[PDB]
Amino acid sequence: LFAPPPRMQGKEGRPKPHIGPNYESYVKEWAKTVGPNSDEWWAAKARETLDWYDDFKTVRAGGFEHGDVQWFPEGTLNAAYNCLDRHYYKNPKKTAIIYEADEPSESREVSYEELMQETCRVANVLKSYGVKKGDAVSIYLPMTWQAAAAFLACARIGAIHSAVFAGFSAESLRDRVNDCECKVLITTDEGRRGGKTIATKQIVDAALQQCPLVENVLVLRRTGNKVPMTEGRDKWWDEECAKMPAYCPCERMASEDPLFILYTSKPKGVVHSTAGYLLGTALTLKYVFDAHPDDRFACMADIGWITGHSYIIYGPLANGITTAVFESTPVYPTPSRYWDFVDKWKATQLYTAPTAIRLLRRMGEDHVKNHDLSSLRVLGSVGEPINPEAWHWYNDFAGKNQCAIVDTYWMTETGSISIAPLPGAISTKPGSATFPFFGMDVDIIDPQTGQVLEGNDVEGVLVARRPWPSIARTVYRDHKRYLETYMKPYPGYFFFGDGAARDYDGYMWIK
Amino acid sequence: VHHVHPLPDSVPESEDLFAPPPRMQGKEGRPKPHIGPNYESYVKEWAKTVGPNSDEWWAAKARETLDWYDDFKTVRAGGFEHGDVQWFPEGTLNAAYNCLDRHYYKNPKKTAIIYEADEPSESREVSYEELMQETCRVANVLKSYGVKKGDAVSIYLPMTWQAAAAFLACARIGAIHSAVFAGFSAESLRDRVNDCECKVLITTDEGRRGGKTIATKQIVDAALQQCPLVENVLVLRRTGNKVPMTEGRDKWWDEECAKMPAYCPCERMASEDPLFILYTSKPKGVVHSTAGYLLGTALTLKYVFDAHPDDRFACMADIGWITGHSYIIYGPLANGITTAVFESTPVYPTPSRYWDFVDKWKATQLYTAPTAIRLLRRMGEDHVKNHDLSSLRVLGSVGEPINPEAWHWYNDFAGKNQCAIVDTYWMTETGSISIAPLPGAISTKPGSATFPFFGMDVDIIDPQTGQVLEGNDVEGVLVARRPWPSIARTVYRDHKRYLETYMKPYPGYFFFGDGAARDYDGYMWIKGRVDDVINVSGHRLSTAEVESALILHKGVAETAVVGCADDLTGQAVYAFVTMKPEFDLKEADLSKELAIQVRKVIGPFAAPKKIYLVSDLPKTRSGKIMRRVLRKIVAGEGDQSSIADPQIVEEVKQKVTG
Amino acid sequence: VHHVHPLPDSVPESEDLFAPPPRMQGKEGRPKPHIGPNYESYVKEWAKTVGPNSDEWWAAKARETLDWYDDFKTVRAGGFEHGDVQWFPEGTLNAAYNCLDRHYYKNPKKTAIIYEADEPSESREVSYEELMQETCRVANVLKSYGVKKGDAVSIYLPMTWQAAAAFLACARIGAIHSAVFAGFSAESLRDRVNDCECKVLITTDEGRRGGKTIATKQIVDAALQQCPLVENVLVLRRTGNKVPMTEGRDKWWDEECAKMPAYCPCERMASEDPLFILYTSTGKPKGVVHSTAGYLLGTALTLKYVFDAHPDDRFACMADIGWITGHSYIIYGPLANGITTAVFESTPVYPTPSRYWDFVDKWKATQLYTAPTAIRLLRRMGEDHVKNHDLSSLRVLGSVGEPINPEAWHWYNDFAGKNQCAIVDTYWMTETGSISIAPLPGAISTKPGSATFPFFGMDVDIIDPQTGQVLEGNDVEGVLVARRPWPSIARTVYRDHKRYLETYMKPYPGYFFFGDGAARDYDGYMWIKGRVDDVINVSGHRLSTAEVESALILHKGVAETAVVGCADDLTGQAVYAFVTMKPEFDLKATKEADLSKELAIQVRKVIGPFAAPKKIYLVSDLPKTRSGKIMRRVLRKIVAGEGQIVEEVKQKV
Ligand SMILES: CCCCOP(=O)(O)OC[C@H]1O[C@@H](n2cnc3c(N)ncnc32)[C@H](O)[C@@H]1O
Ligand SMILES: CCCCOP(=O)(O)OC[C@H]1O[C@@H](n2cnc3c(N)ncnc32)[C@H](O)[C@@H]1O
Ligand SMILES: CCCCOP(=O)(O)OC[C@H]1O[C@@H](n2cnc3c(N)ncnc32)[C@H](O)[C@@H]1O
């Protein structure tokens, strides 16, 4: 066990946590977010967290059975306005993105103003190509800060972006491009990671040879090395944006308009809508990571995955804080890079996968023991169970046993963290996600019985009892596959696909 | 000394007045009427809805009745002269939101549609949840075809419940639906599909009505060979019989919808955005806009039929005509009540069908047409006399004048003398009911529409004089003084025809095209189309008044009178007469009895010069008597395909020319 | 004593200050000024509109002046450096609603347009009802061609009242209109049509201007042979004479409109959606883009305050909708205010040079707005055309387009105004959207040739082009800059934002650069001296075109002049003058040599000895654009040797 450490109780001049100090304080608030009286909390949270063009009237409707989940349906908003414009109007020079380049010397801070201006220019480029509200746009970009401008330009005009991880092959890119039927692709000339050159345009050129709908390719000049360019079809990002004004109006989006598709391994195009997803990411960032206005949030994932979607771009920028976009690897130049980064920028949270937490602990304690790491308050794990040898090391060499460790469990289809400790309220057990997040009423069902095994010291499949705002709404042009995979196996429930157990202490353990 | 006479009736005028019966007085546990309990309560509310200070009532009614995304500022503007009528123009709303979403959110399992299939066993209740989900899937299918706000979508569907989902899916996204009655020939379909220039058509494999199979998909294919703009066809699998499916163009409804999410956002529509095009009988595309039309249907449904939240409204018309647009789909669903989609005919499997339907579902109101009333009246009382039917409180009649004889049969046997009868006058171009009794307030006369609805200020003009005839006991052509919210806004891409037809004949007025009389008590009588008058020796006759006289004779089921030129009287009346099957047939003596009764009740100038006793009248598939055919046959123009049974035409030619 | 001099004038400076006359004082039954009665009343209101606390006033004026569908939250944002200017960004509205619907709802029979046809008898009044219905019909026609929000639509229409309907039909549905002056060549039309990539073009069969025919449809057909994207052409039947019509592509306005309803909904536009592109004529055609709310607010406010417009005024701007002046002060400005605006189809000299004054007395115009070129044309025609007219309905007379010489200014004040009108010399540009510097007629005492003081929201300064630094205080001369964005500034150059930044934002970083020379005199009055590019540096003495031309016109029988610089080895540059004499002048009686001597002598007395021209050319007319601006770049290169009025000038040179 490990109760909330000094940095998560207001001591040493730190911000006091939003939920604290004990489990009773967490349960008091979470109880407001589930059950038949939880609309009130969700309605206020919706109106306090997001800027709306038109208010909503209904909080929620629909359910798992037919896949017609609705949240704040009559409201209209825009994700770019909430992640850029509204913070730009309040503090234009605040840093939105810490761009940590592959080479450390090339890093620099990108203000909300600069990010909004680039987003507006790209939005104007997409409009000049004929991209309309509801069209899909594919994005094949590595971890340069302009990836955020690419996402938010699509959201700004109501286009649906579909991000394709920049390590995917020509065939995997082709499949995802063809499935979403985008007519525009946004990519780079080359990607730079761990000191090597990704030939992204070369992969794009070979992929597009079997992509008959793509008519326009916008190419970011990331390296300037000679890459092939197809006349008419291919245009340079900087040359196109130079022609455009640095402001663009926001399309007024219905709450349930699709915000993006994310193909997850045939590739299944997981579709998230606008307000519910945006709310879930902003509330999870705030409470699960205890974000405060001046925080510098360092999520080391990739924007090609949902972790990059929710916890690099949408979550942090919606909260108006600073977010890191890390271009390199955990061990380039040396295995100390994560900590070189943490002290150089004074990151207040770090968020990473157990895979990397174990490629660092394997590289030796010499790379972490002589750093400050004092700016960190919360350390986060995501993607896979953290072995108890990894949990203790991340607490020791990364937190100096003074940061809370949040084991966050979720999936692409949940949009936002489902079960995790709130670091100022929950005492952690290594390898446990502990209690479920606001809006997540989870239970355990016996697969041999189809019956929920109530109580403690139980084990079975993990399910959810009621829809939550950030839940994925469909699988793109394959709603049947959406109902069969998540909704058919346990009627009245959502089926995560993961086994789980709840021990005597009520703590959840994800198998 | 009254110059205006009621439609011929066998009941004395002094005993032919019908006050709201106990079921419409808040007795017997029935809901109390919204407007009651006498005429002055009608006038009291009506007076707030016309004239220089009616904006306040209409602004308030609009905001109470409909859920708006954005409020309106202006209540009304525009006018007849240039056809620029506007209502609530700055407001935005969506018709599918008002007909589905807002009721789904309140009571998702409440029944939206009683789907009464052709085969009675296959009937079932469709919840607001289920109808909304199917509406959103179809809307999502339409968007995947590139249907945008303001695009036309043709609909060629019979009376299954999915037809409501087709209408509402178009409105959900701001597309303009153009519904085509599923009984129309390939040529009529083609003409409508081309005129509206839609790129998408929604239809069935087949339809089932009265136990026969309608080969809609086959008809579609013949039409589409002459509709170059149609790219997508969405085919509902209603029967499952093998039908042709053109690769690429044609997709199955259930297969497309299975790919799509069960919710879809609503397009935020301006008040004056076109909601639909409805062709009449070149085909004239009557355009209605959104807020004023929807408000019109919701208010008339509520007040003309005294609808209350648990009512099960049984309008037996077809969504292919305005009666089904306004009083099956939009009016009843906007009010959040339960509405019937009746897939069958009134006499299938037997003429007991309406009454089986009423008691099975405890229908609270019934709304049908005089041809159906006369059709069941013909088949006798065995099929109706032994039902309860006490769930009914209001019985409606629409489409033509209802002969008093038929009115009394409706009142005696459908209503067991315990329902109010609402004779509702209106047209496709008026959007909603223009003149009718409010059934908790108005004392009814058989054959009279009585008094104008909220927002309708109607007068009678002497057509020779062009001036309004002030007062009572007057006769002329019906006109409306000011625009009302649900009036048609244009004729599709033919605004000149719209102004020339309704707005030019009497400037400052809307011209209905009907002759009308207001009697001594102020009751309005719709007598017929202006174009259909018979002039005999200077006496102008409506067909309805002579036909009402003929049906007072025992054994008569239905008649159609026509005028024919005459050298000494200008025209003469000719009558085609239909008898109940039970009547014992001699023919020459019955015909003389019929002519004598017309001369006694109207005058010798109305007496048919000749009477043709036929076994059936020529009727279209939609049920109307084919009067032009009868006229042209009497006129010697026998050699000059809407006919439901063409063998009848030869039978009529034989009896006239043989 | 003063380093900055007024433009040379025959009147002594101490009698040359003109307080608001009684028509502008609320006497004789005239409306009381919105701002008055003196300089301090102007300053008191103007201080609310600039500086770090001016949001409150702009938010109030925006909500009071325009009808909004959605309110805004942010008043202003962005700046010159990147060209991301935003005003009222979250608000939504529609320009057609604001110029038509809301006035139609209140008083439908009020006259929106006084249509003054080429022939005076063919003129008539167009109600707000009639104009709204024609706008809605055309908007419905455009929607039937598939025009969507954000599409561009070219307009090649002469000055008939339907030009306003075509602009507003585009605004009504959110299309971006691109108007092209109806006299432009086919090659000029082609370039503008292709640049904006429109698929629809609105035009006439023919235009009528001064009894001459404008083969608009013939010119169009030539242009469209090289315009591949244009699919639909809507042809107004202005004359009904036989013009070619291409089957399918071309349709008749009246036949299309007759099929359409006479109401059409308004598209809900964001504040910063583009309203129109307007191409200007030193390089390629520059497509200046204005957005919706700020531009409309600016034209509405300037119309109200610079011309002191009141609800029943009959505003007579004599420009052409092909230029920004007609955009701002014929259509959008006056119709947003709900008043009556004039659409004048003729020329100032058709039928007689009394047309303007015939027009003014026929309609009882309350304000007149025209250009110095027209003023100096009527001047040379003689005063009998104006002398025996009433003209008393007038309260404000305005001048736009170029520096107005004091000689022209007094002729305007004495004859057009009978010394009872305020003269408002209005300085601005296509790129400013609306009037930038002008007298407020109920408050400001005018000097002949001074624009006087900045408008609400305009915070201007003078920079020394030789140092890049602002000149502090009064009695200074340099180049005019603005310190902050204003609501109606142009947002970009269409698909060429880099040219927008390089031209306006980069010359003096931190400021907006107008490209004009200017001086702020000892009283704080601003004087616009000419274009920076037209300045002539004679041995260090920087001479502006306006002051030398204003000197030359003080000579008897001089009608109009242009001076340009060319390099001379001794003085670096020397002044070269092209002079136009009134047509009655006897060129044989006066040897041109003695004319030159008296002219060069007259220049030395008002400006200085360095300012005399090195050579004077007598010409019959000067090279001018279709707008009327003198094409001094042509004269400068022709004088520099580098080669129909141009062939006459080159031969004479
Ligand atoms: C988490 C988003 C990254 C990619 O998301 P994805 O590719 O959709 O995969 C989701 C799967 O990650 C596993 N997982 C996630 N967090 C935990 C945790 N804290 N403890 C144990 N397992 C975890 C689950 O098995 C889940 O199903
Ligand atoms: C009304 C909806 C279906 C028909 O709509 P439509 O096809 O546009 O027919 C309009 C014409 O039907 C006649 N009509 C209609 N209802 C009545 C009535 N209650 N009493 C007398 N005549 C009536 C009129 O002549 C009218 O003008
Ligand atoms: C203003 C609309 C018509 C021309 O619009 P434009 O074609 O954008 O011309 C812009 C240039 O016109 C000159 N100019 C304009 N008005 C004045 C004035 N009152 N005094 C002195 N000069 C003036 C300037 O040099 C300006 O830069």
Coordinates of C-alpha atoms and ligand atoms in Angstrom, one line a residue, chain A residues 306-307 382-385 407-412 498 510, ligand 1:
Chain A
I306 CA -5.9 7.0 -28.4
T307 CA -3.5 7.9 -25.5
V382 CA -1.1 3.2 -19.4
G383 CA -1.6 0.4 -21.9
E384 CA -0.6 -2.7 -20.0
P385 CA -0.5 -4.1 -16.4
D407 CA -2.4 3.1 -12.8
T408 CA -5.0 4.2 -15.4
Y409 CA -7.1 1.5 -17.1
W410 CA -9.1 2.4 -20.2
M411 CA -9.3 1.6 -23.9
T412 CA -9.9 3.3 -27.3
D498 CA -10.9 -7.8 -20.3
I510 CA -7.3 -5.9 -14.3
Ligands
LIG1 C1 -5.0 2.3 -22.5 C2 -5.0 3.0 -23.9 C3 -3.7 2.5 -24.7 C4 -4.1 1.7 -25.9 O1 -5.5 1.3 -25.8 P1 -6.1 0.1 -26.7 O2 -5.0 -0.2 -27.8 O3 -7.6 0.3 -27.1 O4 -5.9 -1.2 -25.6 C5 -6.6 -1.1 -24.3 C6 -6.2 -2.3 -23.4 O5 -5.0 -1.9 -22.6 C7 -5.0 -2.7 -21.4 N1 -4.8 -1.8 -20.3 C8 -4.9 -0.4 -20.3 N2 -4.6 0.1 -19.2 C9 -4.4 -1.0 -18.3 C10 -4.2 -1.0 -16.9 N3 -4.0 0.0 -16.2 N4 -4.0 -2.3 -16.4 C11 -4.2 -3.3 -17.1 N5 -4.4 -3.4 -18.4 C12 -4.6 -2.1 -19.0 C13 -6.4 -3.4 -21.4 O6 -6.4 -4.8 -21.8 C14 -7.2 -2.6 -22.4 O7 -8.2 -3.5 -23.1

